[PDB]
Design an enzyme around this catalytic site. Structure first.
Site, mmCIF file in Angstrom:
data_model
loop_
_atom_site.group_PDB
_atom_site.id
_atom_site.type_symbol
_atom_site.label_atom_id
_atom_site.label_comp_id
_atom_site.label_asym_id
_atom_site.label_seq_id
_atom_site.Cartn_x
_atom_site.Cartn_y
_atom_site.Cartn_z
ATOM 1 N N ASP A 83 2.395 2.173 7.429
ATOM 2 C CA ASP A 83 1.046 1.808 7.013
ATOM 3 C C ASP A 83 0.071 2.070 8.153
ATOM 4 O OD1 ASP A 83 -1.296 0.762 5.889
ATOM 5 O OD2 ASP A 83 -0.400 -1.167 5.459
ATOM 6 N N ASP A 139 0.838 -1.204 0.000
ATOM 7 C CA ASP A 139 0.000 0.000 0.000
ATOM 8 C C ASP A 139 0.875 1.258 0.000
ATOM 9 O OD1 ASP A 139 -2.399 1.615 -0.082
ATOM 10 O OD2 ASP A 139 -2.991 1.081 2.012
ATOM 11 N N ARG A 195 -0.440 8.840 1.197
ATOM 12 C CA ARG A 195 -1.227 8.793 2.426
ATOM 13 C C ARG A 195 -0.584 7.925 3.509
ATOM 14 N NH1 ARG A 195 -4.137 6.034 -1.457
ATOM 15 N NH2 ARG A 195 -3.803 3.781 -1.174
ATOM 16 N N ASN A 196 0.355 7.041 3.147
ATOM 17 C CA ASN A 196 1.040 6.186 4.106
ATOM 18 C C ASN A 196 2.460 6.665 4.399
ATOM 19 O OD1 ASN A 196 -0.806 4.300 4.981
ATOM 20 N ND2 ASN A 196 -0.664 3.185 3.032
HETATM 21 C C1 A7O Z 1 1.905 5.601 8.484
HETATM 22 O O1 A7O Z 1 2.165 4.387 9.131
HETATM 23 C C2 A7O Z 1 2.142 4.304 10.502
HETATM 24 C C3 A7O Z 1 1.694 5.332 11.322
HETATM 25 C C4 A7O Z 1 1.660 5.232 12.708
HETATM 26 C C5 A7O Z 1 1.237 6.428 13.521
HETATM 27 C C6 A7O Z 1 0.451 7.654 12.968
HETATM 28 N N1 A7O Z 1 1.605 8.497 13.338
HETATM 29 C C7 A7O Z 1 1.863 9.813 13.430
HETATM 30 O O2 A7O Z 1 2.941 10.206 13.820
HETATM 31 C C8 A7O Z 1 0.842 10.821 12.953
HETATM 32 C C9 A7O Z 1 1.039 12.166 13.206
HETATM 33 C C10 A7O Z 1 0.104 13.088 12.771
HETATM 34 C C11 A7O Z 1 0.333 14.552 13.070
HETATM 35 O O3 A7O Z 1 -0.257 15.363 12.088
HETATM 36 C C12 A7O Z 1 -0.171 16.728 12.442
HETATM 37 C C13 A7O Z 1 -0.604 17.591 11.259
HETATM 38 O O4 A7O Z 1 -1.927 17.311 10.917
HETATM 39 C C14 A7O Z 1 -0.463 19.081 11.608
HETATM 40 O O5 A7O Z 1 -0.364 19.794 10.397
HETATM 41 C C15 A7O Z 1 -1.009 12.642 12.076
HETATM 42 C C16 A7O Z 1 -1.152 11.287 11.841
HETATM 43 N N2 A7O Z 1 -0.254 10.390 12.269
HETATM 44 C C17 A7O Z 1 2.475 7.360 13.582
HETATM 45 C C18 A7O Z 1 2.124 4.076 13.298
HETATM 46 C C19 A7O Z 1 2.571 3.029 12.498
HETATM 47 C C20 A7O Z 1 2.589 3.134 11.103
HETATM 48 O O6 A7O Z 1 3.058 2.071 10.396
HETATM 49 C C21 A7O Z 1 3.867 1.078 10.994
HETATM 50 C C22 A7O Z 1 4.444 0.191 9.911
HETATM 51 C C23 A7O Z 1 5.749 0.407 9.485
HETATM 52 C C24 A7O Z 1 6.288 -0.396 8.497
HETATM 53 C C25 A7O Z 1 5.503 -1.416 7.936
HETATM 54 C C26 A7O Z 1 6.067 -2.274 6.841
HETATM 55 C C27 A7O Z 1 5.231 -2.588 5.618
HETATM 56 C C28 A7O Z 1 5.511 -3.669 6.650
HETATM 57 C C29 A7O Z 1 4.210 -1.598 8.335
HETATM 58 C C30 A7O Z 1 3.672 -0.795 9.328
#
Ligand code: A7O
Ligand code: MG
Ligand code: MG
Length: 301
Positions: A181, A163, A167-168
């Site tokens: 993700d 994916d 967006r990710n």
């Molecule tokens: C995006 O992915 C992940 C996100 C996360 C979370 C979501 N987080 C954020 O830091 C975050 C911060 C903000 C701030 O926005 C402020 C603004 O709006 C102000 O202007 C908005 C949304 N999210 C981390 C965890 C694991 C996530 O994935 C873990 C992961 C890593 C690697 C893999 C590989 C493919 C197997 C899978 C999963």
């Protein structure tokens, strides 16, 4: 996402308690994202890691609507993040809470949020005077290079993401890009970027034709998706194939070699590398290391 050994069953991976953190030492804040069964919430963690840091983190967790299958999916995500190891351009694991209550997955917090929203908001801010600083081409090249490096890392660990999309991607301090993700913390059921195909809700406009037609996912299909991500970057966050309905005609068009036109802000050689990611023959696409090499040169000028 899937990791090759045939694919590894993530349920069989080990959880190492080196990651364990006491849930009582999180103080939660605002919700950052939510899907049907899961969410990500900011928190302050007290005494996290080797340095006993006190810092803002993100916590992925299940909602009260979740059942055992979603618990298992969240645990699989935790185990795979621990298995893949750490890199500057991925969303890294910092800890987990598995004893004494619901599973909490503690990750880095990325203060600028997702790349797609960031590009869209920044475009609007840049038009605002007529209607901090503006984006420059070099910034777009750095975001592209950073995501490519994260992807090269994942590919080096036999990980197929499935994916890849703006967006990710998150942006952290210094506007450094990180691929992850959102998974369960994404509301796919009400998201126009995920289309019903069979049982599943799939990001079909990002997907390689062999993934759509033969349900084959490889590192080469992630490269296709990365090409689409490049188009998102160099259009400052337009929707792919804009205005085109996903139906059998779209499906046939892409299989027959239809490609999106050059986005407004792509230099010719960036559009060329997009086109190369969209080769119909998967083995003809660039590798992530070739993309990294190319983009590191382009971004460092
Ligand atoms: C995006 O992915 C992940 C996100 C996360 C979370 C979501 N987080 C954020 O830091 C975050 C911060 C903000 C701030 O926005 C402020 C603004 O709006 C102000 O202007 C908005 C949304 N999210 C981390 C965890 C694991 C996530 O994935 C873990 C992961 C890593 C690697 C893999 C590989 C493919 C197997 C899978 C999963
Ligand atoms: Mg100390
Ligand atoms: Mg300690």
């Amino acid at each position: 996402w899937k990791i090759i050994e045939t694919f590894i069953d993530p349920t069989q991976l080990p959880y190492n308690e080196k990651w364990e953190f006491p849930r009582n030492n999180l103080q939660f804040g605002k919700t950052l994202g939510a899907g049907a069964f899961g969410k990500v919430v900011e928190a302050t963690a007290f005494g996290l890691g080797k340095e006993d840091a006190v810092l803002k983190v993100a916590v992925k967790m299940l909602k009260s609507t979740a059942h055992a299958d979603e618990k298992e999916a969240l645990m699989s995500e935790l185990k795979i993040m621990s298995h893949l190891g750490q890199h500057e351009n991925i969303v890294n694991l910092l800890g987990a809470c598995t004893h004494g209550g619901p599973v909490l997955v503690i990750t880095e917090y990325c203060c600028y949020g997702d790349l797609l929203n960031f590009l869209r908001r920044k475009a609007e801010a840049m038009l605002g005077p007529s209607l901090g600083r503006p984006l420059e081409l070099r910034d777009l090249l750095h975001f592209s290079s950073q995501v490519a490096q994260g992807m090269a890392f994942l590919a080096s660990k036999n990980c197929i993401h499935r994916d890849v999309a703006a967006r990710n991607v998150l942006l952290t301090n210094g506007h450094v890009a990180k691929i992850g993700d959102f998974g369960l913390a994404r509301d796919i059921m009400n998201d126009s970027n995920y289309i019903v195909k069979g049982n599943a809700r799939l990001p079909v406009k990002w997907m390689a034709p062999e993934s759509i037609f033969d349900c084959v996912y490889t590192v080469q299909s992630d490269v296709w998706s990365y090409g689409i991500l490049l188009w998102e970057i160099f259009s400052l966050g337009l929707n792919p194939y804009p205005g085109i309905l996903v139906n059998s005609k779209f499906y046939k068009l892409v299989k027959d070699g239809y490609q999106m036109a050059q986005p407004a802000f792509a230099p010719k050689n960036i559009y060329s590398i997009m086109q190369a990611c969209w080769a119909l023959e998967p083995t003809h696409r660039p590798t992530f290391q070739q993309i990294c090499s190319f983009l590191q040169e382009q971004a460092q000028e």
